[PDB]
Design an enzyme around this catalytic site. Structure first.
Site, short mmCIF file in Angstrom:
data_model
loop_
_atom_site.label_atom_id
_atom_site.label_comp_id
_atom_site.label_asym_id
_atom_site.label_seq_id
_atom_site.Cartn_x
_atom_site.Cartn_y
_atom_site.Cartn_z
N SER A 133 0.87 -1.19 0.00
CA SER A 133 0.00 0.00 0.00
C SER A 133 0.90 1.24 0.00
CB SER A 133 -1.05 -0.11 1.08
OG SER A 133 -2.14 0.78 0.78
N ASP A 179 -10.16 -4.67 -3.60
CA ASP A 179 -9.50 -3.68 -2.71
C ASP A 179 -10.38 -2.44 -2.59
OD1 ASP A 179 -7.72 -1.79 -1.50
OD2 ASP A 179 -6.01 -2.85 -2.37
N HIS A 210 -7.83 -5.65 0.44
CA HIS A 210 -6.56 -4.89 0.43
C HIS A 210 -5.39 -5.69 1.01
CE1 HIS A 210 -4.16 -1.27 0.35
NE2 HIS A 210 -4.15 -1.16 1.73
#
Length: 263
Positions: A133, A179, A210
């Site tokens: 991320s 996600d 995610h």
């Protein structure tokens, strides 16, 4: 003649899908982290030569736990891997990139420290970057700023800009179909499409949240095969891994696959 960086037995699907590679792994906590919050170094005890180093950064609010499974998985195939905690859990991508590079710098320092378990185990000219991320966006910033890096393999990346057209480092993007934090369509896929100059790949896991490439995921065989194959191909120049690195794994778990300039 022979590739000086080739390590380990000739790969098979089975050997890359397994929980562990061929090498025995040990680990230590970094005693005085230099430029980042904390770190764990994973290393092979019995590689037949020096190995490349990979630094791995978590996402916003997250810690080493989220990314730890990569440490043994990669080190067991002949890499030194540092997983970090950031100085703050709320650091943003640019800070995460600085800290990732500081972690690679410290693995280079430890390679020269006679008291370190990794003394003389690292080829400090061969490094790679991974992360989740904002730590994946940080990996792409690291690659853009440090084009001598040999490979990048972020997961569910995000950055405030998706324009990584400057990146010339071989880059594999792991993405997670469902996600809701960094939607594929607005984050991982634009980032992938921006990169024009490099070997690159996009692998999206079906139904993935995610966290689909984090510790505890149910696709470690496929994700670990691809991450190790990409790093072998590009950090070690190891063309034994060219087909594993470049292929569409044609897998039940893959809901989007793209690649370009792969050999």
């Amino acid at each position: 003649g022979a590739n000086p960086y080739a390590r380990g037995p000739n790969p098979t699907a089975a050997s890359l899908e397994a929980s562990a590679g061929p090498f025995t792994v040990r680990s230590f906590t970094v005693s005085r982290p230099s430029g980042y919050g904390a770190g764990t170094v994973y290393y092979p005890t019995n590689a037949g030569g020096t190995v490349g180093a990979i630094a791995i950064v978590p996402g916003y609010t997250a810690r080493q736990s989220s990314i730890k499974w990569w440490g043994p998985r990669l080190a067991s195939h002949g890499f030194v891997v540092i997983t970090i905690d950031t100085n703050s859990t709320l650091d943003q991508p640019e800070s995460r990139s600085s800290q990732q590079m500081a972690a690679l710098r410290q693995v280079a320092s430890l390679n020269g420290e006679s008291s370190s378990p990794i003394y003389g185990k690292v080829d400090t000219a061969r490094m790679g970057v991974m992360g989740w991320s904002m730590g994946g966006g940080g990996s792409l910033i690291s690659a853009a700023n440090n084009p001598s890096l040999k490979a990048a393999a972020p997961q569910a990346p995000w950055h405030s800009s998706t324009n990584f057209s400057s990146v010339t480092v071989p880059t594999l993007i792991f993405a997670c179909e469902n996600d809701s934090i960094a939607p594929v369509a607005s984050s991982a896929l634009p980032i992938y499409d921006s990169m024009s100059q490099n070997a690159k790949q996009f692998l999206e896991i079906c139904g993935g949240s995610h966290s689909c490439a984090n510790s505890g995921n149910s696709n470690q065989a496929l994700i670990g095969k691809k991450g190790v194959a990409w790093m072998k191909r590009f950090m070690d120049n190891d063309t034994r891994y060219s087909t594993f690195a470049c292929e569409n794994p044609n897998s039940t778990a893959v809901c989007d696959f793209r690649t370009a300039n792969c050999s």
